[PDB]
Paper text:
The temperate phage lambda, which infects the bacterium Escherichia coli, belongs to Siphoviridae. The virion of the lambda phage comprises an icosahedral head and a long flexible tail. The tail, which comprises the tail tube and tail tip, connects with the head through the neck. The neck–tail complex comprises a channel formed by stacked 12-fold and hexameric rings and a 3-fold symmetrical tip.
The portal occupies one of the 12 vertices of the icosahedral head. It is formed by 12 copies of gpB, which exhibits the canonical portal fold of phages belonging to the order Caudovirales. The dodecameric portal is located at a unique icosahedral vertex and facilitates the transport of DNA in and out of the head during genome packaging and delivery. The structure of gpB comprised 4 domains: wing (residues 24–249 and 368–452), stem (residues 250–279, 343–367), clip (residues 280–342), and crown (residues 453–511). The tunnel loop, which was previously indicated to facilitate the dsDNA translocation in the portal during packaging and stabilize dsDNA to avoid leakage during the phage maturation, was well resolved. The asymmetric reconstruction of the portal and capsid at a resolution of 4.0 Å showed the asymmetric interactions between the gpB and gpE subunits, as observed in the structures of phages sf6 and T4. The portal–capsid interface was analyzed using the PISA server, which revealed the salt bridges between the gpB and gpE subunits. Superimposition of the models of the 12 portal subunits revealed that a loop (residues 208–218) in the gpB wing domain underwent structural morphing to adapt to the portal–coat interactions.
Author numbering:
A (entry chain X), C (entry chain W), D (entry chain Y): 24 to 301, 320 to 513
B (entry chain h): 99 to 341
E (entry chain a): 321 to 374
Write the structure that this text describes.
């Protein structure tokens, strides 16, 4: 194997990266990496587009809840399970989407906003934190309030050097698990120095009090790594290249002409360019033909092509960056060159695979943990009532009661008719159900059925024709 | 042929250093262990180390050393029973004795007696079985057969101080002792601010390395252990010079 | 990890950005960024076009209400809920569509105009403020009025610095939530010093008095940042390049000839150009063939290509800017290269996802808060009546009684027939309903049904063939 | 044969490789190879993209179980086998997707995430290790928890040399089989790991305690070799070329002019460039026409094309690299040049064969061994009940009881309609069953049938027309 | 003495010295077409078509 040797002709003699684990390769330069990621996101056209694409395609404009408890494992009964599901869905739909935005203490976000912020933070920071607390002062029905904790806040106390059990402000027990997180207060101008406080991950009763979501790379990864490390250098260098090229184009186009003479500086401009001494401004009205002596001269400068191949090389760099981040080149660069239907659909599939992966993991895990943390108050506060003859209580199997799957926004097809024809033909055969077909459009099928069963009565009362779906 | 970049060479050199450090620490541990048995006390000293003298009280009646009377070399090699003295020496121990350790010169001296030869080939007068002939000639230890009740062991180990090799046992000593004797293997606390920042204490063989950014570069390597070998009951053995 | 290190060959040895939250990176330079963005919106064609795109596609020409109270939780009944929804919709439609423009104190807007201005002022400033007051002296049916406040006005009293509990003119309690706002006075003349007031966010009864809508990015963010921060520099440099290239082109094309001689200025032009002495104007009639002695000469100066690769560089920069803003490139630059149907549809859908997200969050939240503030009065003044035997009073649950869904203008498809064909195909099967299809054209299905039941009778009475939807 | 000679004209007289086994060619430089591969994965746009493609297409977003014990061999009866399979699938589904993430020791991942990490580890390391351990003190139902181990950790103890039986920390018996592994503990603060612990591959009861998965190349291969070894040199050299080209373009485009004169450099720029001395800045407003004495001279430099063909070379090298790695060039480079439907489908198929091979081998073997290791404890703790009248107990035939086939995500076709049509036409004839077609869409047919049976009665309750699949 | 490939360098040349970046010919100046002609000849000789051979 020449991969692990000197190389072709010893060209790789100096390439000896150290064999170190991810913990020893990320942590020493953690804060600078996160800061550079934020700086790229905050001051680039392409990075903000990548973040916006992540938010808009992973989640969208609505992130609905669909509760499907595991009744067979508990042994409660179908009707009771459905009654409980309907009640809990109604209660959650009331609590989540309040326009008073009182789910978080700051009163600035709804639930879908919080999921979108979680996805974005998972994009340009590699990790998200959510703190679930209570408010005894609040008189509302439900006392649960959540928060979003920026990853910069959670660090080692007083910047004390790192240790074995306590790495980067996240405490680790004897195994790889984590127990508590040191989180600091943040006041930008001043006041007393930052006070680092302790917040346990889980309360003694088993409830989840602090949330941390990130996908590991190796066996042990205390804190996550952002997605930009692959291509942080190239975006900065492309920024420098674009700014330099634009300034060079301005400079080259600025100097229109050139005058060589031997008289006074103003007399030469008076007699050649035609300015008036009644530097000396020149009026742009009309055409002019100067008169020159043998000594004088006039030269009309010629500048190089403004865009001499820069577009193609920017195309190459954007292809590289799009490969690095995950979004397809056509989405990130807005180019949309002449492409057939096949190429466009293939590229859409390539984007959608990754977007489905991210939606299934990041937002889904955050939403599931949030929903369970809320469902504990409800069950306890008797806002809803558990079914009878339960084999296990709520605390024994939390996942059993809160087993849920969420619906996001669907895909906007390239050709609208063809997907509808596909869905209809699949429905006509037995291969797919109505629930999946109505879910791929971001609809809840029970609501749809209630809608048709009400619309048929409305049409009957008003005197119109019965609809197609009505049963004779 | 083959050959490698100047980097493989650094990984190989770095290892053999680890091996040497471990071997040196193990030698120090074993030297303390052996010196704790032969005589009651042993002294730890060096050039940069302030002398400390560990002392476990062993009675004067132990450490039997042969003198102008009662020595095996001067006495006849025929017509003499070594076994009689062995019992008299072992009467001084506290607790039963289940093993005997011979320095090979001492073993050659001991098996030369004809009476011990007679104890082997008796039909009903003993149950002792030895291996008088050559058994092990390269190994450090040679478990010979049980002689009566106690086992017989010949130990010829080598610790090197300076360039010259040296033997552990001091030239034909014999050490009566119990194979289940309560021995302690105590390891102290390491004193290194980096180690204590890492959170480690009271561990054996804490390894580390660092880069000193000097003119020729250089990265070192260091094992530190801080060992101390004790004996809970120092008078369970009986050391004999056997001259 | 090479991202957090020195870099490739030490090229990133000086790229060391500060690690600070949104507050420490936004508050010191808020006014300057807002002023520059306002300059770009006011004095650049492309940015104004982007703002117009935002206003027209987010909201449209109408912003209709659809009231859907959660009657199941309240325990009131379906029919009473329908009657209440009809009554409140009629009252809102009459109140907010007054021809005399009396929803707002300034008497200069209507409801749709106010929502559009809110979206736009969100776009180029990052937040929108709406103040709800009363005019006690007025004798109309409803005394509620709303005033639009520009974000520039909210500032610390007496232009002091930011204290811990008062950041950027917004009071902050112990948690991140706001408590009250500081408002300056409208000073048009430079003199007449300004008076600073105090306006609590919510009246003691819980009714909304001052409205602040903006999407946070991090944990603690007192005020947001507008959409232009990604491309503030590039648009200004692009404008400078355009102006400089145009001036240079005019200068280079101005000098159409050059005269070499050794005589007086007047006589040389008389003999070669053909001017007359009775500098000297020349009339353009005819073709002229001068006569030159050996000493003289005449050079017809040549200029470069006027547009040498400037258009493609403008294309690259406009693609970058559009990617930064969120509007599609063909919507921003009006380019419309020769492209197939698939590419155009892909671009339209990619922009549409973002547009729908913005409409679902910004305009919907603002309109919902305003509608709740109006519905309190309707209920209290007994213009409308609450359903009897209600589980909760109105105040205990404002969202449940005032839950509302808004419908904007529907998109204009690239292909006219295919959208209709897919709508009919969906309706024929069970995959959708009449409400969702009629909503995608910005229509309410109940109004369509009433119109159809009127039209069938009108046709029947007059002697015409009954319509297609008529029942036998 | 000229292959084994000196060559055509003596050109290959130096290329004389030694004939060595895979062990002697891989082991001496194993650690450096792994380190360089990880370095490429972390800091390359194309390497991270290739790993993401592996993870997303081999496994996807969900990785589901299908339990099919061999009834005929065990002689138990069909219906009892189906009932046992149903109970086991229910129990595994309850245990696999726990939201608390207790399946792994570190409580950071769920099951399918563990499969994805296994696939990634098999990508850029050549082997994956999973350790199955018990938690005696755990009071939940299932004690067995699995822990991932990176292959860096498994090495020789105390820096010993490679021996006949112990190679790279993997002990080998007389034959080629392995008995146990030596695992260190990598600790972040400091390096040079401290202690090594011995853990065998199998407990004396036949239970699995260590999982090792890889594909061998030759007879005796103790540890695998990653896929990157074919393209480790070319990717590094390509990265160097790209960074050098970018820097060279910036430098060449940076110097826009050149001023040649004799006066002081301050007055030279004052009288030519247009600056002011009230070096020095030059304002970028308007156009300028400087006046030059004979000694002066102004040069407007012109540089080479920014991409003088780099883009074409990069294409060739990416084709080579994609050939090495396995993903098609189109997916790896995001190029997607304009092409037909046939070419796109052909490329997708040629990648798909490789991806299905990887899923059938690596992920499937790992998942099956995990499932069996859980099933032993499941039977032991009597969470399930084996069928009676059993010829072979559970211990004798482990694979006959836990014989399972996993279903991953299905392919996204280029055409939505064509795949549905072809599936329907296969269904119409006897060529394919329901299970194959519902499996090609990532669906278990039993769940679909249960959903359809529930939905037909749901519709019949509301008064809608029966669906097509409903029996008359 | 080996150079280091990283970076973009601008040397400073004294009047005596100089630097020349050699330009080489097209690495494939028409060889493909000659291959096409010869392969057509060989395919005609052997009996297999040109597509099946080349």
């Amino acid at each position: 194997y020449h991969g692990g040797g000197s190389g072709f002709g010893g060209q790789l003699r100096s390439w000896n990266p150290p064999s170190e684990s991810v913990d020893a390769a990320l942590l020493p330069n953690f804060t600078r990496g996160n800061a550079r990621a934020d700086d790229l996101v905050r001051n680039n056209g392409y990075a903000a587009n990548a973040i916006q694409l992540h938010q808009d395609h992973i989640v969208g404009s609505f992130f609905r809840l669909s509760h499907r408890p595991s009744w067979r494992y508990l042994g409660i009964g179908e009707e009771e399970a459905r009654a409980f599901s309907r009640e809990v869905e109604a209660a959650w739909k009331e609590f989540a989407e309040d326009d008073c935005c009182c789910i978080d203490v700051e009163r600035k976000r709804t639930f879908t906003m919080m999921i979108r912020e979680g996805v974005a933070m998972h994009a340009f920071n590699g990790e998200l934190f959510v703190q679930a607390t209570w408010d005894t002062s609040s008189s509302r029905l439900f006392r649960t309030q959540f928060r979003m904790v920026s990853p910069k806040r959670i660090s080692n106390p007083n910047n004390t050097g790192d240790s074995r059990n306590c790495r980067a402000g996240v405490q680790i027990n004897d195994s790889g698990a984590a127990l508590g997180y040191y989180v600091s207060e943040d006041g930008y101008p001043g006041w007393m120095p930052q006070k680092w406080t302790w917040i346990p991950r889980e309360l003694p009763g088993g409830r989840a009090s602090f949330i941390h979501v990130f996908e590991p790379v190796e066996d042990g990864q205390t804190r996550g790594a952002n997605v930009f490390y692959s291509v942080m250098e190239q975006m900065k260098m492309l920024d420098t290249l674009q700014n330099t090229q634009l300034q060079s184009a301005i400079v080259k186009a600025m100097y229109a002409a050139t005058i060589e003479s031997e008289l006074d500086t103003q007399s030469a401009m008076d007699f050649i360019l035609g300015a008036n001494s009644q530097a000396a401004p020149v009026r742009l009205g009309g055409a002019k033909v100067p008169h020159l002596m043998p000594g004088d001269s006039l030269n009309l400068q010629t500048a190089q092509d403004t865009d001499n191949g820069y577009s193609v090389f920017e195309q190459s760099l954007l292809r590289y960056i799009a490969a690095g981040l995950g979004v397809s080149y056509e989405q990130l660069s807005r180019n949309y060159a002449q492409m057939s239907y096949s190429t466009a659909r293939a590229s859409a599939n390539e984007s959608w695979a990754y977007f489905m992966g991210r939606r299934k993991f990041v937002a889904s895990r955050q939403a599931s943990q949030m929903f369970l943390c809320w469902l504990e108050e409800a069950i306890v506060r008797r806002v809803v009532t558990l079914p009878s003859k339960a084999r296990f209580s709520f605390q024994e199997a939390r996942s059993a009661w809160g087993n849920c799957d969420w619906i996001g926004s669907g895909r906007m097809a390239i050709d609208g008719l063809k997907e509808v024809q596909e869905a209809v033909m699949l429905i006509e055969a037995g291969l797919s159900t109505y629930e999946k077909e109505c879910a791929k459009r971001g609809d809840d099928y029970q609501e749809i059925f209630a809608q048709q069963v009400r619309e048929t009565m409305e049409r009957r009362a008003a005197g119109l024709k019965p609809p197609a779906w009505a049963a004779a | 042929q083959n050959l490698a970049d100047p980097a493989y060479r650094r990984r190989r050199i770095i290892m053999q250093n680890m091996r040497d450090e471990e071997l040196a620490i193990a030698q120090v541990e074993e030297m303390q262990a052996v010196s704790a048995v032969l005589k009651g006390k042993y002294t730890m000293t060096g050039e940069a180390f302030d002398p400390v003298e560990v002392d476990m009280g062993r009675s004067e009646e132990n450490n039997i050393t042969q003198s102008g009377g009662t020595e095996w070399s001067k006495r006849d090699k025929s017509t003499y029973d070594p076994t009689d003295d062995i019992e008299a020496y072992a009467l001084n121990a506290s607790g039963v004795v289940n093993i005997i350790v011979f320095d090979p010169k001492g073993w050659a001296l001991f098996r030369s007696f004809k009476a011990v030869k007679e104890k082997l080939d008796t039909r009903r007068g003993s149950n002792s079985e030895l291996e008088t002939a050559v058994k092990d000639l390269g190994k450090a230890v040679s478990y010979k057969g049980m002689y009566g009740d106690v086992a017989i062991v010949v130990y010829s180990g080598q610790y090197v101080e300076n360039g010259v090799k040296k033997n552990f046992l001091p030239d034909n000593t014999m050490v009566l002792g119990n194979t289940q004797a309560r021995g302690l293997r105590t390891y102290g606390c390491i004193q290194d601010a980096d180690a204590q920042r890492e959170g480690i204490n009271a561990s054996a063989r804490y390894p580390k390395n660092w880069v000193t950014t000097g003119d020729p570069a250089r990265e070192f390597t260091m094992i530190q252990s801080a060992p101390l070998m004790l004996l809970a009951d120092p008078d369970e053995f009986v050391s004999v010079q056997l001259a």
